[PDB]
Curated annotation (Swiss-Prot), chain A:
GO terms for cellular component: cytoplasm; nucleolus; nucleus; preribosome; preribosome, large subunit precursor. It is found in: Cytoplasm; Nucleus. Associated with nucleolar and cytoplasmic pre-60S particles. At the end of biogenesis it dissociates from cytoplasmic pre-60S particles and is likely to be exchanged for its ribosomal homolog, rpl24. GO terms for molecular function: structural constituent of ribosome. This is Ribosome biogenesis protein rlp24. Belongs to the eukaryotic ribosomal protein eL24 family. One of its GO terms (biological process) is ribosomal large subunit biogenesis. It comes from Schizosaccharomyces pombe (strain 972 / ATCC 24843) (Fission yeast). Involved in the biogenesis of the 60S ribosomal subunit. Ensures the docking of nog1 to pre-60S particles. Activates and recruits ATPase afg2 to cytoplasmic pre-60S ribosomal particles. Keywords: Cytoplasm, Nucleus, Ribosome biogenesis.
UniProtKB/Swiss-Prot annotation, chain B:
It comes from Schizosaccharomyces pombe (strain 972 / ATCC 24843) (Fission yeast). Its main location: nucleus. One of its GO terms (biological process) is maturation of 5.8S rRNA from tricistronic rRNA transcript (SSU-rRNA, 5.8S rRNA, LSU-rRNA). Keywords: Coiled coil, Methyltransferase, Nucleus, Phosphoprotein, Ribosome biogenesis, rRNA processing, S-adenosyl-L-methionine, Transferase. Belongs to the class I-like SAM-binding methyltransferase superfamily. RNA methyltransferase RlmE family. SPB1 subfamily. S-adenosyl-L-methionine binds at D3, D28. This is AdoMet-dependent rRNA methyltransferase spb1. The chain holds residues 91 to 329 of 802 of the full protein. GO terms for molecular function: rRNA (guanine) methyltransferase activity; rRNA (guanosine-2'-O-)-methyltransferase activity; rRNA (uridine-2'-O-)-methyltransferase activity. It is found in: Nucleus, Nucleolus.
Curated annotation (Swiss-Prot), chain D:
Signal peptide: none annotated. PANTHER family: 50S/60S RIBOSOMAL PROTEIN L14/L23, LARGE RIBOSOMAL SUBUNIT PROTEIN UL14. Belongs to the universal ribosomal protein uL14 family. GO terms for biological process: cytoplasmic translation. One of its GO terms (cellular component) is cytosolic large ribosomal subunit. It holds the Pfam family Ribosomal_L14. GO terms for molecular function: large ribosomal subunit rRNA binding; structural constituent of ribosome. It comes from Schizosaccharomyces pombe (strain 972 / ATCC 24843) (Fission yeast). Component of the large ribosomal subunit (LSU). Mature yeast ribosomes consist of a small (40S) and a large (60S) subunit. The 40S small subunit contains 1 molecule of ribosomal RNA (18S rRNA) and at least 33 different proteins. The large 60S subunit contains 3 rRNA molecules (25S, 5.8S and 5S rRNA) and at least 46 different proteins. This is Large ribosomal subunit protein uL14A. SMART domains: Ribosomal_L14 (SM01374). Component of the ribosome, a large ribonucleoprotein complex responsible for the synthesis of proteins in the cell. The small ribosomal subunit (SSU) binds messenger RNAs (mRNAs) and translates the encoded message by selecting cognate aminoacyl-transfer RNA (tRNA) molecules. The large subunit (LSU) contains the ribosomal catalytic site termed the peptidyl transferase center (PTC), which catalyzes the formation of peptide bonds, thereby polymerizing the amino acids delivered by tRNAs into a polypeptide chain.
Curated annotation (Swiss-Prot), chain E:
The chain holds residues 83 to 117 of 117 of the full protein. Residues 11-24 have a biased composition (Basic residues). Residues 25-35 have a biased composition (Low complexity). It comes from Schizosaccharomyces pombe (strain 972 / ATCC 24843). Its main location: nucleus. The keyword Nucleus applies. GO terms for biological process: assembly of large subunit precursor of preribosome. Disulfide bonds: none annotated. This is UPF0642 protein C32H8.05. GO terms for cellular component: nucleolus; preribosome. Belongs to the UPF0642 family. It comes from the Eukaryota. The keyword Nucleus applies. It is found in: Nucleus, Nucleolus.
RNA sequence: GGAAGUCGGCAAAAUGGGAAUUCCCACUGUCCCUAUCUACUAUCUA
RNA sequence: GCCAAGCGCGACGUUGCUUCGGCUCUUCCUAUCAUACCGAAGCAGAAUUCGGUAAGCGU
RNA sequence: UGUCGUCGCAAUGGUAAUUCAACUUAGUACGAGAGGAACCGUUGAUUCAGAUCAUUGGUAUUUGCGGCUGCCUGACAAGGCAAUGCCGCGGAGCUAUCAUCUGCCGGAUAACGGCUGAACGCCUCUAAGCCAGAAUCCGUGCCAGAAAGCGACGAUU
């Protein structure tokens, strides 16, 4: 159960939603909706499309990074042994990261408005 | 009552031929219907060629071979073999032959009487070998990310990995960027190449251009034009 | 050597993966196939009743040795975690973001030396060297790039196409530092990797493998004693 | 064939020319008949990923052409829904030349391999390079 | 193959019902029933 | 998907093209297999 | 023709060579191709052959 | 049927599911070998039927938003336009084996296999009797509800 990121909108793609597209280079494009899928079909550049996350990232409208709580998430290809206490701590860690990430989400907007 | 080209019947034909030699040969090879037209067309054409094999074996100089053929794309190739192996070609449709069908009677008169039957002609692989055409209009694909025109020819002539990559130095130096973009999946920028390292450090090259080269396939007409203008500027810089 | 069959399919190599420290079998199918492996390796190495990417072709989709295991990037997270729980700790498990997800089909690896696909990515080769701790050779088997499927490789023996030349046979055996035999399995099935799985002490062949082929693999593998 | 095959959207009807993905030398496959077609009135038989159909080699070697003989579809243009809910579609309609037993005549394939085709045909999965 | 009105199949369906299959169903009703 | 429709490329889209009525290529709701929209008709009222 | 129970015929037997024409459609019939169940056969098994019940359901 | 309404009853009429191959039983029964079953159980898929719109595709008069061309206000801007000018996206609705769900149980028989058992001191599946038994038959279930079939209940100008 993985919530993937759309190639175009960089938004959350959940099971059932959107489309998955495989290229001859075995590379997989997942689209959150038909609008993003068609935009890939006309091959519009995400950074050049005004509403995409890639545009909002590489135009100064969103933060380069946030090491909130020194870590937020990562693509871990090495599986980890289960532990109830560890699975507990990360869940508390996740909400703490989200709250702090929400905190910077507000100051930065104040900075841009200023 | 035997096969047309069997070794035994060929012995019987030459057994009756004796001092005489085959002057005119008629052929009415007719495969059954009930399959693809292309299958039936090639089934008739191969049976014509493979029956044309026994002809040159048995035919006298200046002989005539009248055979029924099914018109197809291989029909032009079959006429070519007829032209080299016979002096005159008389492909025609008699009034009695049904016009709705492709029964064409080719009269190959004036047998060339070659010294020996050419192995290329004997072998159907060589005769019906698909002849390559001029370079595919890959510039149209470059200029038009749209127009999905049902491309169906093969897979780049036995190309195992379709993710073809082209060196940055090779792409810049080459005089045919249109075919590079049309054929290559991406313009690779390996770190080992000293020229590629120069290309990264070049002020003209930008992050968008690097992203465009990383994924050529997901690019519009304007992005391709910008890459083409970029490579020309690099070419102007080198000389 | 033992004759085993998955359902009515003799290509047990496709539906299961065998190593020198663990065994991999499909999920949700006939329990007889898992029991066959358990009867011969249950008390030796753990056997994992798992599937990859929701597929029963885990044998040809996964590549690994007795130390480590590799799965394609298409492997689901739930499948990846399930492998870690079942497999023991000294067995590393690693994902591979490769253009060719058929890792088992493209890489034929034993515990010590591995032969990989000629077009395998450099990052994949680095990951193989890190996790498998094996020397990686980029070559081909009998002129066919699918080394993992056209070559059955073990510590004390290897099997390749019967069409390979003698000098190619000797060169491959010298490179693989192992005795190697050019032969066929499953009564003419030239895909030895698909029809044969062998560890360092036992071999498993398809139910359609001839007795002559069974005698041959036992002799080259020296597993009679 | 090994194991049951789930129903998926059909997008390769008869009278279709499709790309031949193996290294046997064939280029274009022409669909003439589809195995396992019921008596449906005025319905064109159709093919999907992993389905075996009678195909004729339009382009390729003269020797293997003129054989109406089964081919397994490995990639389908039309979007189809996997039972997990996600939708997939490939750019090209790719098929592999196979004997009735279930073994590919060629030695290697080109392009991604649909997983549904891979699980259905173990020999195809054995000869597959990228199962996506 | 026979349909759903096959007499032998209806016999076999009874044999499923006369075992824990219908049983599991009875107390499953009893649980929500005593609720 | 691409003439598999029908006695048949009739009408559309393609631009229609190439080669000897035929073949090849392209094209399309002709067909699989229909679905949606619009105006008018149709309906009721004086 | 030979017999020939019988009532000159004479049964069964026996000898003698020898305009029409087809698409869709609706139902219906069984004189049943398949599906369901039985019977017989040197029917080992498997695949059949033949014969019954049978028009529910397809073709 | 006082009147109106609610909740039901059910005479009768229609009916619906079809077929396949995969797992296990198996490489067992059986077979010199070659080969190779089936029942129970299980999973899918065809044809058909009844629905449905979560997801996907299609649809565009949402004339919803944006872009382009041209036109009109002296200019800028501002707008408005153009038989629905052109293009992209587009909810909502409709819709698609281009998407998804669901598709039931009792007896009674035919062929046939028998039980007891006379006729006929034996025998006999049959005469009187009785079991087993077909996708068959009749029910169940599902659809309608007699607009001159009916019940209980509520209140009463």
């Amino acid at each position: 159960m993985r919530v993937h990121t759309c190639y175009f909108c960089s938004g959350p793609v959940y099971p059932g939603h959107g489309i998955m597209f495989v290229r001859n280079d075995s590379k997989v494009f997942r689209f959150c909706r038909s609008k993003c899928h068609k935009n890939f079909k006309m091959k519009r550049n995400p950074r050049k499309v005004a509403w995409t996350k890639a545009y909002r990232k590489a135009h100064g409208k969103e933060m380069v990074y946030d090491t909130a709580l020194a870590v937020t998430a990562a693509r871990r290809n090495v599986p980890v042994r289960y532990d109830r206490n560890v699975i507990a701590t990360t869940l508390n860690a996740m909400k703490r990261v989200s709250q702090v990430h929400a905190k910077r989400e507000r100051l930065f907007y104040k900075k841009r408005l200023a | 009552v035997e096969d047309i080209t069997s070794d035994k019947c060929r012995s019987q034909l030459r057994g009756y031929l004796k001092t005489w030699k085959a002057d005119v040969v008629l052929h009415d090879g007719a495969p059954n219907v009930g399959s693809a037209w292309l299958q039936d067309a090639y089934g008739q054409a191969q049976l014509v060629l493979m029956s044309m094999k026994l002809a040159c074996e048995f035919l006298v100089a200046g002989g005539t071979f009248v055979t029924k053929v099914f018109r197809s794309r291989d029909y032009n190739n079959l006429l070519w073999v007829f032209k080299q192996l016979f002096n005159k070609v008389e492909a025609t449709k008699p009034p009695s032959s049904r016009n709705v069908s492709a029964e064409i009677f080719v009269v190959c008169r004036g047998y060339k009487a070659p010294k020996k039957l050419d192995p290329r002609f004997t072998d159907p692989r060589t005769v019906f070998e698909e002849v390559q055409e001029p370079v595919t209009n890959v510039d149209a694909k470059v200029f038009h990310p749209e127009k999905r025109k049902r491309s169906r020819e093969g897979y780049a002539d036995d190309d195992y990995t379709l993710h073809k990559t082209v060196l940055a130095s090779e792409f810049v130096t080459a005089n045919d960027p249109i075919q590079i973009l049309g054929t290559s999946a991406e313009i690779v920028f390996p770190k080992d190449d000293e020229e590629c390292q120069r290309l990264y450090n070049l002020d003209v090259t930008t992050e968008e251009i690097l992203l465009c080269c990383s994924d050529l396939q997901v690019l519009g007409k304007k992005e391709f034009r910008d890459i083409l203008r970029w490579r020309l500027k690099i070419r102007d810089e080198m000389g | 050597a033992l004759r085993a069959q998955f359902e009515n399919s003799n290509e047990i190599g496709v539906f299961s993966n065998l190593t020198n420290s663990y065994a991999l079998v499909a999920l949700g199918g006939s329990e007889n196939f898992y029991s066959v492996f358990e009867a011969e390796l249950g008390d030796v190495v753990p056997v994992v009743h798992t599937t990859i990417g929701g597929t029963r072709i885990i044998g040809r989709l996964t590549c690994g040795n007795r130390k480590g295991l590799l799965v394609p990037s298409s492997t689901t997270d739930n499948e990846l975690q399930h492998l870690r729980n079942s497999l023991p700790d000294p067995v590393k498990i690693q994902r591979v973001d490769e253009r060719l997800s058929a890792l088992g089909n493209i890489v034929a690896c034993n515990d010590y030396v591995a032969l990989v696909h000629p077009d395998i990515e450099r990052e994949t080769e680095e990951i193989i060297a890190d996790v498998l701790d094996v020397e990686v050779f980029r070559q081909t088997v009998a002129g066919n790039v699918l080394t993992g499927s056209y070559c059955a490789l073990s510590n004390q023996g290897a099997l390749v196409h019967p069409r390979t030349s003698i000098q190619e046979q000797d060169e491959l055996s010298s490179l693989l530092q192992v005795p190697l035999v050019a032969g066929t399995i499953n009564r003419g099935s030239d895909v030895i990797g698909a029809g044969l799985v062998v560890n360092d002490w036992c071999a498993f062949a398809g139910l359609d493998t001839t007795a002559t082929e069974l005698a041959v693999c036992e002799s080259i593998f020296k597993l009679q004693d | 064939a090994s194991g049951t095959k789930y129903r998926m959207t059909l997008g390769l009807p008869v009278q279709a020319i499709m790309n031949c993905a193996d290294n046997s030398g064939a280029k274009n496959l022409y669909i003439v008949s589809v195995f396992g077609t019921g008596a449906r009135l005025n319905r064109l038989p159709a093919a999907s990923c992993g389905d075996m159909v009678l195909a004729t080699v339009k382009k390729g070697k003269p020797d293997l052409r003129k054989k109406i003989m089964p081919a397994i579809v490995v990639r389908q243009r039309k979007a189809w829904r996997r039972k997990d809910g996600v939708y997939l579609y490939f750019e090209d309609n790719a098929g592999v030349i196979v004997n009735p037993k279930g073994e590919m005549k060629g030695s290697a394939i080109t392009g991604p391999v649909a997983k549904e085709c891979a699980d259905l045909w173990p020999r195809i999965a054995s000869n597959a390079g990228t199962v996506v | 193959t026979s349909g759903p009105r096959d007499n032998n199949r209806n016999k076999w369906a009874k044999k499923h019902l006369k075992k824990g299959k219908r049983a599991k169903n009875s107390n499953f009703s009893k649980f929500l029933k005593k609720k």
